[PDB]
Each structure stands twice: as structure tokens, then as C-alpha cells.
Subunit: 206 residues, 4 copies
């Protein structure tokens, strides 16, 4: 659990996120909880040119490490860590299906039993605020109080979990749920859902 | 036809299922008929970390082999083997188009002549029941009486055949049929179908 | 222009057709004009297991070479060669967008200037008849009189051209046109088209 | 900044454009500003067979280099360089989502904050004119006056930027925006947009 090992894992998560089709260009960013702050990828460096030296340490006070590039969306990663003590890794991306649902400003309802992976019977959609603002941070903190993932209106997705592998796995499951929702919404609105009783049973089993 | 060779084949089927885009994360599972029970993949191990030692033998009585991980959906694989004596391999996944049709709770009708590959003029959709329950097992057993594949409402797909290669091949053909159905349903409902007379001719030819 | 070189080229076309996402499983088949008949791939052998020895010579009289596997759709390849003397290679597949348009039983109209690549202002859709029948052959022969590609209702696509590379290239362009048509049809029906005057200009330029 | 290095970069951009799924077959073409004209890829050579010797120099007067293949869409690349002095690289392709929006003859409105990457609150759609004509060149020049990318009605996309990497990056972001727009248009028309006030804030931040 030293810095260089975590940096390697962050870079591998970025590569896998791109291979799964969730990250295109420079939209995504990943972080892990570390010491009193987090290690995060910088803005604007494509995944394939990322090296261990690019990873930035931002402390608990928001001070950025000397000589590193900026990460313009760092504030909502820190908001996730403060809102969910149990989160140790945060994945952000603008995956296409998640993002399309966020444009409609809809939560994803219980259309499939795997919705329980994010903690409840829905994937919420937090209201729009400019990237990098305190306002956006507060909406994210409130959406993650009782959920491990949330859509960001007109923006994309945030998913958090106990480690990088589970956070990426969750981000991918939410993109699958978003694709299922949009595909079925085009045919019938509203889409059939499982009852709260049924999701309660699934949550216990998980 | 020894255990290690079949284990290898199960792992290769998992890899191919992922390459074809039918399996994402840990949703899919594959089994083969073996001795008095079956060999199956365990729950929660991503395809890329699967080894021969992970494959679990579950006997005819439902006893799990010592020291292996659980497979929470094993009951509907055993239900398939008991319902269809001719089935020697079972593929389960949550492929996106198959799963979207299962959310609509519709059977796939005879929109293409390749629907006859599953045995008749449709791909049924079995009613929802919690994963791992006897109730879900009974719905699957009834749906597979006269069909080699079935959708599972709010869940995914089950396909069975005489060997692993044909079972995967069938699972992929059903995902293609589901994509054809959703794509055309978005434009016109209902979608034009081939008559029962025409499917009877195709079934004889196959 | 010896048999072994053409067999190699047929196998490479099969591989590329799969890489482009146009061919899945065992649905596609490819042929080239050769001596008094054609060389074609057999039914049921997946692309990855195809060898030079699998390629079948079918003469002008329809006699199949000794000891080879059958090709159940050979008749419409021969119908293409007889209908279009200029065709030297024929590609058949069940590409998803082409096939979805064929289920709707619609021709693809001039929604994009590249429609002229198939010879006119449309991609026709030939009426359904059972695969392998003389009836299906006659519908294909008539559809290809003035076009180099045609959809097959409830079935898929046939594209022909002067060599294997151009035939595959055309098949891919028709799949792109079909995807453009279905994507726009879901939003507005009918879809805006270029006038016959404009397609005439493009045809001259090509 | 010698010719051979730029030729290599053009070929690598072509390969990456194909890997990202933006270019299929021979539809796309790329250029860079060079001396008094530009270096561009020729018409009809598939990306995989492109060599450094294929790259064509077209001067400021429109004279083509001796012994090279033609590039039938060269005129709108030159129109981009003359209209936008700051552009040093131009990417053209017929990416499917961009092209479908161009068939509808719609601009892409501010459905996502990344629309500001092209310079304003929209991606315009320039009116149809035959490829290779002065008329098409004039429509492109006018559309790029205040935007770095534009759709071409019934045709495709043009994107320009300060170097090849940023031009490709922009082309991909516009294809993502087009996919978001079509996916949401199928569910609700019109699609919710960010206000001009909000895009003004984002533009300043960028
Ligand atoms: Zn973002
Ligand atoms: Zn399942
Ligand atoms: Zn066929
Ligand atoms: Zn073009």
C-alpha cells in the first residue's frame, strides 16, 4: 500500500476503463483515498501517455502537490470521500448511456435486480452545477449519502467503492443499467420495474 | 472427456463470451454436464482471473465440492439439465439486448428465420423470481421444455445445447435476434413476422 | 489467379468481415467467380477454423466438388453471377442493421450521397423466400439487375463487385447506410432524402 | 516539422481514427497546414495500405504535386485553412452519429457542457452541396467562422484545431455529443439544454 503501487493501479484502472468503452479521450478521472487526502489523475493527459509521475497527491486541506498538473474536478472526489467514509476509490467518467440518462434528468429506477449493487432501488441524478464548483460538490455529497453511484445532470457518472476494482466494476454495471433503461424507454415509457419488496430481498442476498 | 479438459473448455467459453460482448464483469456463468452433476464457474471471479482450480463440481444431490466458492445461480443450471436430458452445456449471461427484451416481458417472435435455431417460432420469456430460488428454477424448467433458450424477466438469458461451442453459438444468435427485435420495435409495433407455415419449413431444413 | 491464392483471399475476407462486425458465427458466406463456376465457403464452419481445404468448387451446372461440406445458400451466389456478368465476388451476411431494415421490408432511400456506390438512388429489398430455393434465387437475380447490393427480407444482405476487397467494402458501406436509416427513422418518418437530380450528379462523379 | 515526420503523424491519425470507430473504409481524410498549402491523404487508399509516399502536397494555388493520387474533397480542407488562420490540422469523416444528425439537418444544441469545446453553444450543420464543389467550400467556410467543427448535411463531419491530436480529440467529442443527442431525441424532442449563461461560464473556464 505504498504510493507507487497505488499509482500503478490507478493507471491500470484508466486503461481498463477505456477498454470497456466507458472512457473516451480525457473525460474520465480516477482517485484513491491515501494518507490524509487522495491520489488522482490530472486533467488533460490521455490515458496512454499517463505515467506514475503524473499522479497528483491532494491533501485533506485541498493543497496540491508541488509541480503537478491540475485536476479541475478534484473537489467532487474529495466530497465523495468526506460523504462516504467507507469509500476508498472513486471513478468518474462521461460514459455515453449514463450521460444520456443524465441529460433527461431522470434517476434509473429498478428495471433490473442488479440496481441493488449501488445500495438501493435506484441510481439518482444530481442536479447540474458547473464543474469544479462547491455547489456541484454539495449535490454530489447529498446524492451519495445512501447510494454508491450517482448520475450528474448534463455531465456523467460518479461511482465509489472499497477498492479500485470494485469501483470500476460498479461504474460498468451502472452503464449497463443506463443502456437497458434508454433502450426500453424508446419503446415504452414508463418502463416496468421490480417492486420495493423484491429489491429488499435482493439487497439482503447481496 | 476428463475434468481438466472440460475445465479448460469452460474457461475458454467464458473468454469467448466476453470477446463477443455477451458477458461483462461477473454476470455470466457456464456449466457442463459431468458424471452425476455438473461443473460450473463460481460467482464473483472475473473471467480473466479464472483458473482450472476455481471450477466447482456440484453433484446430482446439490452437494458442493469441498473448498470451492459458491455459485448462487447453480439451481437453474441443474433445472435445465433435469428438464432437457439432451442438454450437455448451459450458458447464462445478462447480454444487453436479451436483457432489455426481458424487461419488457415479451417473447421474441419469428422476425427472422434463425429463430428456429432455438427449436420453434419464438424465444420465450420466463416470469421473474428471485435468483437462486426454487421458484425461478421451476419457471426455467417449464420454459425449456420445448425450447433450447429462454429469456428471464428482469434478468437475462439461459441457452443450452449439446456442447459448449453450440451453446455459446446459440446464446449469440439469441442476442442478435433480440437486437433485431428492439431496433425494429422502436420504429414499428408490432414487428412483421414470418408465418408458422414458413417456420415449419425452416425447422425441417435445419 | 490460381485456386490456392483465391482460397486464401476468401479466408482473409471472412476474417475481415468478422473484424468489421458484419459477420457473427456462421451466418456469412463468400464466393468468387472461378473457371466455369465459383469457389465458396461451406455452411457451418466458423471463420477461425476455416482452412484452404474447406473451400468448395461448385461448377456452372451446380455440381459440388467431391468430399466437401455443403453450402446451403449456394444457389443465390450462382444467381448473382448469372445476373451480373461483371460480378466476380459475392459477399453474404446477416449484418444487424441491414437485417433490421430487411425485417421492415423497406428499401434504403437516398439519405446519404454514398447510396450511389450500389449503382442508383436506393438499396432494394427482395421479397422473402426460403433459403436455398429457386424462388429466392429469382428474387435476388431481379434485385441485382440494376444494383450491386440488395437486402433480403427477413434475412440479410447480398453485395457483389469486381473483386473481394470491393465487395466487402460495399457490404460495409451498406451496413453504415442501414444504421443511418434506422437511427434517423426512430426520430422522424419519413427521413429526408437527396433528390434524384442530386444522385445523378454523384453517380457521374463516381 | 519536416515533411516525413508530418506524413507519419497523418498516417497515425488515420489509424487512431479507425480504432476509435470514427472512420470506416475510405470515407475519412486528414490534412495539416504545411508551407504555403497542406499535406493530405488521397482518395480511395484504405488506411492500412497508406504509406508516406501516398501523402499529397497541394499548394496555396490548388496545384497538386506530380505523380500523386487525387483527393476529391481537397477543396473544403483548403477552405477551412483560409477561413480559420489558427487551424493547423483538419479531420474529415463520416462518423455514424455525426452523419445521422446531419441527415436530420439539425445543429447539435447545448445538451452537455462539452459542447463548448467547439467554441460556442452549438455544433452547426452546413447545407448540402455536392462533394468537391466551390459551393460546398463556401458553406464550410461560413460554418467554421465561429466554430471549430461543423456537420455537413447528408454527408459527415469536419473538425479543425491547432494540431492533429487536438483535431482528432475534437472530432471524437463531437461524435459523442451526436450520439448523446440522437439517443435522447428518440425519447424526448426537444432535448433539455443548458442555458447560454451556463455555456458562457464554461467557455471562460476552458
Ligand atoms: Zn466530468
Ligand atoms: Zn444472472
Ligand atoms: Zn443467409
Ligand atoms: Zn466526405
Amino acid at each position: 500500500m505504498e504510493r507507487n503501487k497505488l499509482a500503478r493501479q490507478i493507471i491500470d484502472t484508466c486503461l481498463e476503463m477505456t477498454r470497456l468503452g466507458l472512457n473516451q479521450g480525457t473525460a474520465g478521472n480516477v482517485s484513491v483515498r491515501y494518507q490524509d487526502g487522495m491520489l488522482i489523475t490530472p486533467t488533460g493527459i490521455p490515458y496512454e501517455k499517463l505515467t506514475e509521475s503524473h499522479i497528483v497527491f491532494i491533501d485533506g486541506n485541498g493543497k496540491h502537490e508541488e509541480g503537478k498538473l491540475p485536476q479541475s474536478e478534484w473537489r467532487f472526489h474529495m466530497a465523495a470521500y468526506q460523504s462516504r467514509p467507507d469509500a476508498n476509490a472513486v471513478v468518474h467518467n462521461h460514459a455515453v448511456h449514463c450521460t444520456a440518462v443524465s441529460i433527461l434528468n431522470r434517476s434509473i429506477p429498478a428495471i433490473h435486480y442488479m440496481i441493488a449493487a449501488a445500495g438501493g432501488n435506484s441510481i439518482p441524478c444530481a442536479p447540474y452545477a458547473t464543474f469544479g464548483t462547491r455547489e456541484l460538490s454539495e449535490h454530489v455529497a447529498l446524492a451519495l449519502k445512501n447510494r454508491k453511484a450517482t448520475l450528474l445532470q448534463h455531465h456523467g457518472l460518479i461511482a465509489c467503492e472499497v477498492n479500485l476494482e470494485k469501483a470500476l466494476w460498479l461504474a460498468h454495471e451502472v452503464e449497463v443499467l443506463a443502456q437497458l433503461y434508454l433502450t426500453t424507454l424508446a419503446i415504452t415509457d414508463p418502463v416496468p420495474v421490480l417492486s420495493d419488496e423484491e429489491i429488499a430481498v435482493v439487497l439482503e442476498k447481496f
